[PDB]
Each structure stands twice: as C-alpha cells, then as structure tokens.
Design a protein around this ligand. Structure first.
Ligand SMILES: CCN(/C=C/N(C)C)C(=O)CNCc1cc(C(=O)O)ccn1
Ligand SMILES: [Cl-]
Ligand code: NI
Ligand SMILES: [Zn+2]
Length: 338
C-alpha cells in the first residue's frame, strides 16, 4: 500500500525485468498505481536499439506547431500542422537559437521558465507518429508487442482494438507540451524515452481525478459545456501553482533517457519536454482496468474518438457480472487503492 500516493521509482535487476507483465503485477502489489504514474529504470545492460544513427532519416509526416493561449497557469492549446520533416531537420530546428533549451540551474529552475515562457515562440512537436524503433528481436518490454489483455482479445476473439495497442513516436523540442488527460477508455500507457533531453511529468492520483475535473470545469466552463469529457481533447493546461492553490494533490517527476514511465487507469497526467528527444509509447490493459473502462467518461462532441466496446472483456473476464452488467444493474464505485 502507498498511502501518500507518491510517484514510485523501480530499479529491477535483469532477472526481475525480463517479463513485463509479471513486473507490472509486482509494481501494483507495492501500490504504484495509487500515484497514477510510476517510473521504471531498466538495468544498464539492456538496450532496445544498438544504434540510433539511422533514425535521423526517419520522416515526420505532420509536425505540430502548438499555440498556447491564456495566462497565469490557465491555458488552452491548439495545433497548426506544418510541412513534413526528417528527424535530422527537426533536430537542427530544435537546437537553433529560436527553439533551443534556455540556460538553467536545475530542473526546478527549468520548470519555472517553462511556465513563464509558454506564450512566446510556439514550439513544434513531432507527435503521434505511427511506428517503433526497437531493434527486431528485442523480447523484453517491447512496446510494440506487450501481450496484454488487449492483445488476447484482438488475436483470439477477433475484436478491433481501434489501434490503441500500436506504438507511437514523439520527437520533442523544448517547451513542447502534453496537456492534462487520462488515456482513451482510461487505459494504461507505457512511455520509453529512447534518447535526448528529459521529459517532465505531473500526475494526479486516480482517487483525486474527480477533483481535477471539477477544478477544470470551473476554470474552462465553455470547454465544459461543449463536451462532458473535454479534457480528452488534450488542449487544457493547468500549472502546478494553480493546483497547489486549490488543494489538488499531485506529484512531479522527470523522466531521463533510457527510462520507462507507466500511467495507470484514470491517472491524469501532463508535462513537457526539456529539449530535443525521442519517446515511444502505447496503451495497454490488465484485468484491473476493466472496471475503469466500463465507466470511463467518453468524448461526446467529436464523431470518431476512440471508443472500445467493453462487452468482450466483461463476458470473458467478469463472467459472474456479465448479465447483471448488460442488465444495467452492475453498480459499484471503483476502489483506486486495491
Ligand atoms: C499511447 C500513446 N497515445 C496514443 C496516441 N493516440 C491518441 C494518437 C496517447 O494518447 C498518450 N497520451 C498522450 C501523452 C503524450 C505524452 C508525450 O507527449 O510524450 C506523454 C504522455 N501522454
Ligand atoms: Cl524559454
Ligand atoms: Ni498520456
Ligand atoms: Zn469532446
């Protein structure tokens, strides 16, 4: 049990690291999910790719220029699509004087500069790129093939996962942002920083996520009246100063190159990149997630958001509740600590 709901860091030996599914069960048995986010540092011997040199030639089809509007810790973001770029040209852009990381003392100093400089030069994010850059044959923690409940349902029952268990690449530069959100259907996610500058994360315990939602509804009431789950648009920024002021419990942590971050069901998170970097991530599920997916609040203003039917999961893994659930009588409130 993790009663403070603080973000945990794990350093498994190679023997402990080999099987991701087993280690994830271990992390939750230590209460790691109560923070909504955890870090895993793999042993120094492990390498998902021997050489990153040829990633320079990888094409970024639709780089995103992030426009931020607002003031004093409350901002809305929108995106402007830019012309296709290779990684090499993106890296040179990121390291130019207009876009490079500012000088800083420590991560805390840099965090301050992030929140002070959001509304000046708009950073460009090479985000949401289909693909993986693991070497072929890496069997440990292969983001492209984790073999979780999502995969079992797709391969054995022939049910469309809607591409949420496929890998995505993120080429960041300084000040590029991911806004406050939980994952689609309130799924888990895993994120590996292949190389480059760090990525800083903010996390809200699942047991306090509703308080973040109430706070955001009061500060963005127009966004709120337009969509019940508007935070899923990933356009809402709220600074740690605002969260402290209104008593929202949260934690922060910086992910360095070579480290995994895992987000848990209904764990709100947000953050920013320190500089040029490259990350890979996917969504996944465990049996524990099923009760979250059954009550996840979905986006009601856009046509084809990611909506996965829960029927197969309840029928196969919750046989004792299936008919009650389809009857509308499977009433419960989630215990985020178990
Ligand atoms: C599993 C990857 N994924 C699926 C992308 N599709 C929505 C396009 C996500 O939505 C991840 N959630 C956004 C996000 C982005 C970042 C980031 O910008 O590095 C960090 C944490 N979370
Ligand atoms: Cl700056
Ligand atoms: Ni995310
Ligand atoms: Zn919506």
């Amino acid at each position: 049990l993790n009663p403070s709901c603080k973000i945990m860091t794990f350093r498994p030996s190679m023997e402990e690291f080999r099987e991701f599914n087993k280690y994830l069960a271990y992390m939750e048995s230590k209460g790691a999910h109560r923070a909504g986010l955890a870090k895993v540092i793999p042993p120094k011997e492990w390498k998902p790719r021997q050489c990153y040199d040829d990633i320079d030639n990888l094409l970024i089809p639709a780089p995103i220029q992030q426009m931020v509007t607002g003031q004093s810790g409350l901002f809305t973001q929108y995106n402007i699509q830019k012309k296709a770029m290779t990684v090499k040209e993106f890296r040179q852009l990121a390291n130019s004087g207009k876009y490079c990381t500012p000088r800083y003392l420590d991560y805390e100093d840099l965090e301050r500069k992030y929140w002070k400089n959001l509304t000046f030069v708009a950073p460009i994010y090479g985000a949401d790129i289909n693909g993986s850059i693991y070497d072929e044959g890496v069997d440990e923690w292969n983001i492209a093939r984790l073999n979780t409940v999502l995969d079992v349902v797709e391969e054995e029952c022939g049910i469309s996962i809607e591409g949420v268990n496929t890998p995505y690449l993120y080429f960041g530069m300084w000040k590029t942002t991911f806004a406050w959100h939980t994952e689609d259907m309130d799924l888990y996610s895993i994120n590996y920083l292949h190389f480059g500058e760090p990525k800083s994360w903010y996390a809200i315990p699942p047991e306090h996520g509703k308080r973040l939602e109430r706070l955001a509804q009061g500060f963005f009431p127009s966004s709120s009246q337009g969509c019940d789950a508007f935070l899923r648009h990933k356009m809402t920024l709220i600074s740690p100063s605002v969260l402290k002021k209104y008593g929202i419990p949260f934690d922060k942590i910086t992910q360095e190159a070579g480290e995994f971050m895992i987000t848990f069901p209904y764990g709100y998170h947000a953050g920013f990149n320190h500089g040029f970097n490259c990350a890979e991530s996917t969504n996944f599920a465990t049996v524990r997630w099923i009760d979250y997916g059954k009550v996840a609040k979905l986006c009601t203003c856009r046509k084809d958001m990611v909506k996965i039917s829960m029927d197969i999961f309840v029928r196969k893994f919750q046989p004792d509740r299936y008919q009650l659930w389809k009857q509308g009588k499977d009433i419960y409130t989630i215990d985020h600590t178990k």
